[PDB]
Symmetry: C3
Subunit: 153 residues, 3 copies
């Protein structure tokens, strides 16, 4: 009755150059506020490490915000958030979830969240992580706006 589980909450995000056309990954707050990691759930190196094989329900919401770029017609821009796992086996990451949506707004600006949640079978030693299209667009402001979680079922 003490299954591994953790709810991570956003932070400012220390800028750290990433590969070109490569999706940046966020790092989080894991012990302050509403965040936490327990029952051997280890959040290390911007990774959420799995303490044991089994089926976990992982979820994450990422609120994006920005000034209207809206440019015929103009080909839409896109914001996207992806949750992926990396294993001992193929170091080649496997995308589990991906909420991607077109954005061609009007008005002073815009802002909206992308929430995904599902259940996958992970093996101990697996490392989860969220990635996003554009880091500068993630609202790091509030704790209840951008989060990431996972718990053994």
């Amino acid at each position: 009755g003490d299954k591994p589980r953790a709810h991570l909450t956003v932070v400012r995000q220390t800028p750290t150059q990433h590969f070109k056309n490569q999706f940046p990954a966020l790092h989080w707050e894991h012990e302050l506020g509403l965040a936490f990691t327990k029952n051997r759930m280890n959040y290390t190196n911007k990774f959420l490490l799995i303490p044991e094989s089994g089926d976990y329900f992982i979820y994450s919401q990422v609120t994006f915000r920005g000034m209207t770029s809206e440019c015929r017609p103009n080909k839409p821009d896109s914001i996207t958030v992806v949750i992926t796992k990396v294993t001992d086996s193929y170091p080649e990451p496997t995308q589990l979830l991906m909420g991607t949506k077109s954005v061609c707004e009007v008005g002073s600006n815009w802002f909206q969240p992308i929430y995904l949640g599902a259940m996958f079978s992970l093996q101990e030693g697996d490392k989860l992580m969220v990635n996003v299209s554009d880091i500068s667009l993630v609202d790091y402001t509030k704790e209840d706006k951008t989060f990431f979680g996972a718990f053994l079922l």
Copy 2:
């Protein structure tokens, strides 16, 4: 085993202006239809008191709808926030929050907002959902706007 859990569906939700405030909490149906409360967890006037302390998964969708309003000008918006109120500390702490900027371009619009996340709630704590604008909230169907939680 069998632990606490519940699934509330939307209802009428009459208007108001009592106690003067913003981000009105919604009312739910705790039994009629797909709705239900079990294992010591009960709905009680906008709240959802937790029977047993432990880790919970709170979730909820609130379908919004309204007639398009002209809108470079700062856009209006919609938001839904789930709150945890505890007797120990008065100040209700916001757990979740989905805010979407609205600025349509047609007859009208609609679109739900869904939020799901796990938290470590305390026994005797009270959960409730709040929305930017109570009137925009759709009350037609129960599968459109719901709100629940269970003990993991």
Copy 3:
């Protein structure tokens, strides 16, 4: 211990005969990739048959993708997705969840996902199916973009 659970994933999709005035259901992948069914959870005939009574968490995400339509302004277009529960008793469906949003996207094309999830009490033999407003709008391209799942609590 051994609780029923299954995570299904989208596939190209095969045209089906148009008979009644109803929502098209989706059929999926239940073994390859991130897909799976276990502990007596049976995926048969486009339905997710419930092995045991009790409470389940049903979830699904359908990423829609289309071409910009046109829109006293013009009434908006819309897309929907609804998880339906069909009982052994009355053959009449029972819409459990329902996600529907309008669309007037001003741009070349668009695309956006719709995620829904909730806990219900289901009986044995009961079936579950995901329906959509427009089949041809569903993005079947990736497994993580359109999925359907459920597990016992």
